[PDB]
DNA sequence: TTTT
């Protein structure tokens, strides 16, 4: 090893690269403009840069989690600050529940059920919390239904994988079961490519009836009772007005770091109470 | 970090980046030749003055919006040499409404009554307006009637978008509602192309009867009755001569000053009255 | 800034770019190849030279205009040496009248009667002083009826605007009144391409009837009576001989010299008498 | 020779080339982060690095070879740490039997008998094991049925050769006998190549009846009697639980060094016996 | 300017371009190899070579002229050694008319007689004058009948023109006029392309006859009379056997010095004499 | 000359270079890592080592020939360790006949028999020979029937050609005798391609019946009595078994060594005797 | 001009450059890899060198000759080891007329008899002495029978191009008597190209009756007549056997500097006698 | 001094 100075600077950015997670540059203009005035007094190229951010992101990728980058740093563990608590209070759910719940599905504890499904109408607000968590995560991954044969457009090789409004075919949907399930598999891409799906936590985000699986134009209802067995559901009956979201990253670090201070066990049970 | 120089000054040139809003080179042609001199003397070239413009654009896009970049640094609270305030006293507008009424459109204040619409004759000179406005705004998107399936063709993530003149097909009637009331919703650009719309500032420059929206060959009016909950409908019936235009930054500076000096509340009303 | 030396020098060639108005690199040679030695003693490249060309030409574009390129900076004073004033004392023009018509014309000192149309045979030699005029000024537009949807193929955003000899269609005839009578409109250009016309100068070197609008295959007489109160008719019936011609930019430097020493009020009138 | 200093580190690196086998970039990521440390301290490109990286890859394909890079460097001896140790005594395998076996078919020791042929359920988890050695070995070949003409897609020029689950087609049959019995043929590529396939060691993963060779539409039986004569049947009817796998690489080194340290000499035999 | 000392010496290869007139590299190769040892000594490249030469190309073509790269520097004044004058004197020339003809042919002089045209048999050598005389000029064009648009292939504004055999067609034949009598008229290229021709000297080396003007299939005679003003005939009934030609630079710059050295005038006549 | 330092280094490569006969980068691996490590520590690049690799190449191929490069270096003198002399006198070959027999081929002693064909079963094992020779020899060509009007893909102007089996059409029989007889003759390639064959030394590795020559689809006679005086027959009736081959060079290179020792005649004679 | 040290040594490869002629690198190579090793030693590029061989190549092409090449340096005089001249010899050619005869051919004395004809069988060897001339010289122009309107494909303005076996159609017949009797005329290349043809020496390698002029399907002899006074017919009716070639530049060279030391006159005479 |  030489051990250089300047180069040394850059270990100092890997930190930044493991303090909220950083993969692409929206983020990184989003933090704060200190270390592009660092950049800009050091070097003004575009080489080194590249190569740490492609290096973090490959680290990021084959080793790191999500969890991982939801553990909070700061303890302030107050109850009254956390404004999605109150949704929860609302729609009927422990507060030591639902938190253990998905402490065992960020952390692949439970490893069988490794989904958590919403259900509720849709002038909610869980796209908004979805949309929230996706952009706190440094590799999150949107289906959005464009294509026939490629619904997982932007889930490459991410965290977490969020599945939007509208039915799969059946031409994937026991496939789906190791994605739905915590499993790996092996799928087909686009054209010449076939990459193994590793197990990663999935939530629906489909606000409607999810398991009411349309094939096309005719509803099927075999796959509903396995998928029982392998999701949780969480429906809700509470509708929220304005002014009740655009929530951040230093309240659901917030809520990581309480609901780990205290650990609940959570028992194996689809269709969750409405207790608490 | 290394803190030399000659980058040094680059942070100087970031002052310029936020004292009057350049995005491309027209604006930074017309400002000063006395930049370009001194980078000129500095160093000739076309990397690090392309990275600082780059950048500056993202962090303005990403961070910065509109109503920051027209607040006024002068004080001087003239209203004789506000040229377009006898517009405003002419068409029959109150010196203390519309002013606090682009305040809130500008800021987001209402949120949900985020449009203002302007009505009347062709003849009166709100186009140069719109435009002298849209070149003070360092991005600006305008609504351009080219493409069947793409209208917001220079609307891309901007600040405030400006609708031209003509009727737009039932397709995405319901998605403008998005763009005319303040709300996020995802919409479809081009061939493989998704990109989510901020609740932006939008204005209405069609002069025409804007609530008359024709379906391509049939005038439909099932959309006129909500709209009226989410814009704002400016009316007037005086017709302007010549020699009443050229509106450029500072008297639009000074204006926006003279109206955050004076805070003056809006009530919820659509149709504005002829009083004041 | 830095402020370096040979950099230093590049502001001496600024003075050159301001002293007779370069754009391209004809005009360059022509001057003097004293520029160009200095130029291969300095450094032998293309990228400070490319850099400062299109500089100075962005700056001519949105900043100079024409007439301030005309203005004369020796006194000679001098109306023997001044050739083309025979030809204005033949035809039947006072000297102190078609002068300040075309100072006013140059500096937009009307507005409206921004348009000078000249008349009589094509013997004559107009053509001649025209190229020259157009040679003189550093962003010159020349109307070549080439395309039949793109004849202002030269007129890119220039200073001149000239009309060459063919009737135009029925389709931006009114558009056309926008750059015959000093005014901004938005025009069509080629695919995908909108640009503003700028109220620029336009002289029409059509020698034939310009009044008689052919449409394609039928004369038209709607635009002649409102063309009448935007342009200015300078007919004449005079015809020239042999080594008239060959002028060059000092002889009308010296005469835009001559004619702004003296200012001379003038009227509102189409039809230029044959008087002086 | 030079001999300078910074390029005497590389020669460090070559140990981790020889240390655990790195082809690509994954494992190198997933081996230890010092590496890219120093490598980003010392020299911030990308000529030197991707020269030692082909040179090492080009060097282990043509001289080094599997079972070079499969010797355990720490002398544990530890068999009850050995976990895959379980599956072989539950299957009904002699401890001193598949070690030797498997020595001696990644040795090239037997010659012709060059191929493991294991049968049972698909619900075992011999595919788990199959593809951790192929992620240990550094040159692993998968055969992945996708092209008509090419099922070979991977085996390009490794050293283990993995079977997955299909039948082959009656065109090169023969010829997969000279990948079955340890020998050398030249065999036909896509367009325009012949590469000559060494003798390279091949197990086949294939859980089903690999006897029952279906020519496209019809099964055939006349290979399934010399086949006999090269490979060797390993069948098993114990089915495995969960949590019996994530098989890392100092598992199979310490299993390969406890084969390695008792030599047990291996008789002539396809159907394995079901003793020990 | 900086005025180093290696560009210094670019000054010194700037008399070369002055000296004889180069262009292109055939006849940089022809003059002498000293000039390519002191650039293969100098620096090695071709990025101010081609700079240097493209500089003087242009300046040659926008400056610079044909006869005033043929006046002669060494004071010969020799007739015997003048090979071409035996041709003259046996055409029945006198020896002080054809030379002040061509003397003010090429300088200008005359300005309607800008053009001298060659008639005898094919046998003669004209041919090889011309080809020689064409070599001499650096900058020379061409008109060799390939396309049936686009005759002057060669003709990219010169200074000498050639006319080679063939017959006009009637689409610009009074543009040949401004061609044939020195004129500047703008005319139009292959697609999309226009060019103003300058007065340049013009030589018909059509040794038929060039009068009777073949339109396609018809022979036309009502232009013959107009050219007979504009042109200069000069036929011949000798015939030159072998060893009478390879005419030089040398030979024809002694020949432009003596018939400069004395100034004859020459009288407006198309058909030249048989006298002297 | 400058002759530095570290390119004299690279003249001793030239020794490698001429040492084991080095082309492309396949035997440079083979051969031993030290030069690499050399290479590595001395400059990381690839501008001058393929610099020196083609400079060998072509100094090889329009110099050097192949015989040159079969001398060994150290005088061993064994006949025991040679286990290919086993071979040849099971077959009933003379030790001293074969020898001096392709000594004489290689070296173009005879002239016109300057082919040997070998003639005899497939499971012997001259196919393995045949490519270790070809292994050995830097220049080699192997003729794969892949192409209609191209067989010789490889044969790129090498050292040694090696026929495979097949028959050739007839096309080109007559010219082949020109390969076959040590003749020189222009032959046509691909498209716009032709190159003139060198009389090379071919040796025929057809076990087949090369005589029978089938055009297409019928076998004809009229070329096998000439090419009895132009190659040699080499028939053997003798099977080998298993672990008789893994020829390297340095046994080849010894065997050439004995044979050079010892210079003995060869009579002109087709079929070899069954003696010695 | 500068002169400095290492660019010096460039001046003694032009002492090679005029050596024994080298235009592009197999001759290079042919010649001595010293200057290979020179050139390794001094700097390791490709854009000085390339420079200077292209310079030399257009130097000899504009300036130098053929026989300019081909004179001896070495006073050898020994007519036992010139190995050609006992063909000349039995052949019936006398020693003092060929000789002068192709040095009048090659220095261009005769001016109209440029060109030898050789006829008798294809076994005799004229075709390989005709391919060691072109060898020798660095200049050489095969006519490939390829094209049906480029046959001179190779013939790209060098020294002597050499007319293979076949036939001429009727469209350049009488432009070939240029080529045949050394003569300048323009020729038609292929596409918008126009280049004259130089007299250029040209010798006949048809071996066949070349004055059988086969008008692709019709033998013409009109052209027979005057061909008998611009060649000359080398006919012989010798044959010769084998190993009667192999002519390199020593010899050919000391020919030439036998037959330049003895100057002999020749007649005017097609027919070549069959004396001495 | 700091490029290829």
Same mark, same amino acid.
């Given at each position: 090893?030489?051990?250089?100075?300047?180069?040394?600077?850059?270990?100092?950015?890997?930190?930044?690269?493991?303090?909220? /997670?950083?993969?692409?540059?929206?983020?990184?203009?989003?933090?704060?403009?200190?270390?592009?005035?660092?950049?800009?007094?050091?070097?003004?190229?575009?080489?080194?840069?590249? @190569?740490?951010?492609?290096?973090?992101?490959?680290?990021?990728?084959?080793?790191?989690?999500?969890?991982?980058?939801?553990?909070? +740093?700061?303890?302030?563990?107050?109850?009254?600050?956390?404004?999605?608590?109150?949704?929860?209070?609302?729609?009927?759910?422990?507060?030591?529940?639902? @938190?253990?719940?998905?402490?065992?599905? @960020?952390?692949?504890?439970? /490893?069988?059920?490794?989904?958590?499904?919403?259900?509720?109408?849709?002038?909610?607000?869980?796209?908004?919390? @979805?949309?929230?968590?996706?952009?706190?995560?440094?590799?999150?991954?949107?289906?959005?239904?464009?294509?026939?044969?490629?619904?997982?457009?932007?889930?490459?090789?991410?965290?977490?994988?969020?599945?939007?409004?509208?039915?799969?075919?059946?031409?994937?949907?026991?496939?789906?079961?190791?994605?739905?399930?915590?499993?790996?598999?092996?799928?087909?891409?686009?054209?010449?490519?076939?990459? +193994?799906?590793?197990?990663?936590?999935?939530?629906?985000?489909?606000?409607?009836?999810?398991?009411?699986?349309?094939?096309?134009?005719?509803?099927?209802?075999?796959?509903?009772?396995?998928?029982?067995?392998?999701?949780?559901?969480?429906?809700?009956?509470?509708?929220?007005?304005?002014?009740?979201?655009?929530?951040?990253?230093?309240?659901?670090?917030?809520?990581?770091?309480?609901?780990?201070?205290?650990?609940?066990?959570?028992?194996?049970?689809?269709?969750?109470?409405?207790? /608490?």
């Amino acid at each position: 090893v030489i051990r250089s100075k300047t180069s040394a600077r850059y270990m100092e950015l890997v930190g930044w690269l493991v303090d909220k /997670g950083i993969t692409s540059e929206k983020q990184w203009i989003q933090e704060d403009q200190a270390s592009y005035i660092s950049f800009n007094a050091a070097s003004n190229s575009r080489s080194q840069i590249k @190569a740490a951010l492609d290096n973090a992101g490959k680290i990021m990728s084959l080793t790191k989690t999500a969890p991982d980058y939801l553990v909070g +740093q700061q303890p302030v563990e107050d109850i009254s600050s956390n404004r999605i608590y109150k949704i929860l209070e609302l729609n009927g759910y422990d507060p030591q529940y639902a @938190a253990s719940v998905f402490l065992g599905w @960020a952390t692949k504890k439970f /490893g069988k059920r490794n989904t958590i499904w919403l259900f509720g109408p849709a002038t909610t607000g869980k796209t908004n919390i @979805a949309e929230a968590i996706a952009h706190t995560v440094p590799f999150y991954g949107c289906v959005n239904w464009t294509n026939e044969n490629f619904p997982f457009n932007d889930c490459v090789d991410k965290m977490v994988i969020w599945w939007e409004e509208g039915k799969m075919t059946a031409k994937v949907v026991e496939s789906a079961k190791a994605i739905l399930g915590g499993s790996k598999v092996r799928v087909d891409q686009k054209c010449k490519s076939s990459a +193994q799906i590793d197990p990663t936590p999935v939530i629906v985000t489909s606000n409607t009836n999810m398991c009411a699986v349309i094939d096309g134009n005719s509803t099927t209802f075999e796959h509903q009772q396995p998928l029982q067995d392998r999701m949780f559901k969480f429906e809700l009956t509470r509708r929220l007005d304005h002014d009740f979201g655009k929530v951040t990253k230093q309240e659901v670090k917030d809520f990581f770091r309480w609901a780990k201070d205290h650990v609940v066990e959570v028992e194996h049970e689809f269709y969750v109470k409405k207790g /608490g």
